[PDB]
Design a protein around this ligand. Structure first.
Ligand SMILES: [Fe+3]
Length: 312
């Protein structure tokens, strides 16, 4: 018995989590870890000839892309249906959340007055002119943040917010979250928007001493209420080892599996906040209840309006 996993979680192998499943069940896990978009393109090409059984992907936008491409099959699982929060799974049962991440505000309190920053709406304040820095619009994390705004506020209000935000940027767009953290730490940027776990990695020395020192200078602000995004798994449309893939998915979504995955990347597990001391110091959060499916729905519109206001 075996199961083949094609995973878009490629920060640093989930190998230990898969080995625990293997030891417990006797099911051999064959994994590949690489960029999610490369997986999607490979599966579209292979179709029925693919050897994927389980597909894991990062970000609402990428999950949506896989869904549109008909990559998943509907599954029935009383465990998943009763254990994964409704907002973090497909209402039609094709994919299921495994970990949670927050896209948050980071600030350098020597450059900006952090007492004025509580939520994303605050970033349009004219006192931050020239002090806001962003990663580029190609990032699914940013697209999903804008989709989040559209879901709640509608297109009109989101566009007003976007115009205000981009008015405050005077620095070229960044190509990654870690480089943006460095710039905020250094003080070339006063304010950035990044995923929470990148800050925790740097603080924990994972990227070496200079990055740790830079990350120590930053104040992380969790917007209240918070925007939540996920990594998710689903069974491939033509999976040969369907039964085994469901068993593995059930394990990954369980308390043990979700904690195992999340502790590797400094993410939050599905149903509890991280026990990691570095992550817990960032503070409590309350989700805004926008569903992951909704984030996917508005992805195309988010890209259109980001382009229109000049988020490049
Ligand atoms: Fe990431």
């Amino acid at each position: 018995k075996e199961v083949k996993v094609y995973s878009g979680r490629h920060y640093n192998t989930d190998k230990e989590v898969y080995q625990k499943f293997q030891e417990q069940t006797g099911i051999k896990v064959r994994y590949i870890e690489t960029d999610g978009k490369a997986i999607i393109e490979r599966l579209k090409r292979e179709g029925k000839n693919s050897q994927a059984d389980l597909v894991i992907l990062v970000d609402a936008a990428i999950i949506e892309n896989a869904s549109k491409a008909n990559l998943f099959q509907k599954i029935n699982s009383n465990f998943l249906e009763n254990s994964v929060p409704n907002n973090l799974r497909d209402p039609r049962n094709k994919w299921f959340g495994l970990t949670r991440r927050l896209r948050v505000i980071i600030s350098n309190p020597d450059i900006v007055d952090i007492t004025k920053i509580k939520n994303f709406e605050d970033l349009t304040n004219p006192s931050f002119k020239g002090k806001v820095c962003l990663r580029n619009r190609k990032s699914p994390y940013n697209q999903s943040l804008v989709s989040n705004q559209i879901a709640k506020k509608g297109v009109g209000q989101t566009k007003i917010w976007l115009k205000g935000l981009i008015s405050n940027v005077s620095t070229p767009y960044f190509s990654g979250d870690s480089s943006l953290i460095r710039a905020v730490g250094l003080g070339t940027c006063g304010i950035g928007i990044v995923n929470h776990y990148y800050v925790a990695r740097m603080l924990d020395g994972v990227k070496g001493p200079r990055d740790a020192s830079l990350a120590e200078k930053i104040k992380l602000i969790i917007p209240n209420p918070a925007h939540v995004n996920i990594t998710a798994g689903g069974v491939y449309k033509y999976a040969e080892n369907k039964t085994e893939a469901i068993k593995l998915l059930e394990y990954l979504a369980s308390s043990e599996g979700s904690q195992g995955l999340a502790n590797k990347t400094y993410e939050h597990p599905l149903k509890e906040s991280s026990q990691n001391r570095i992550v817990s110091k960032f503070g409590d959060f309350t989700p805004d209840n926008v569903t992951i499916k909704e984030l996917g729905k508005f992805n195309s519109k988010a890209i259109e309006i980001m382009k229109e206001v000049g988020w490049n």
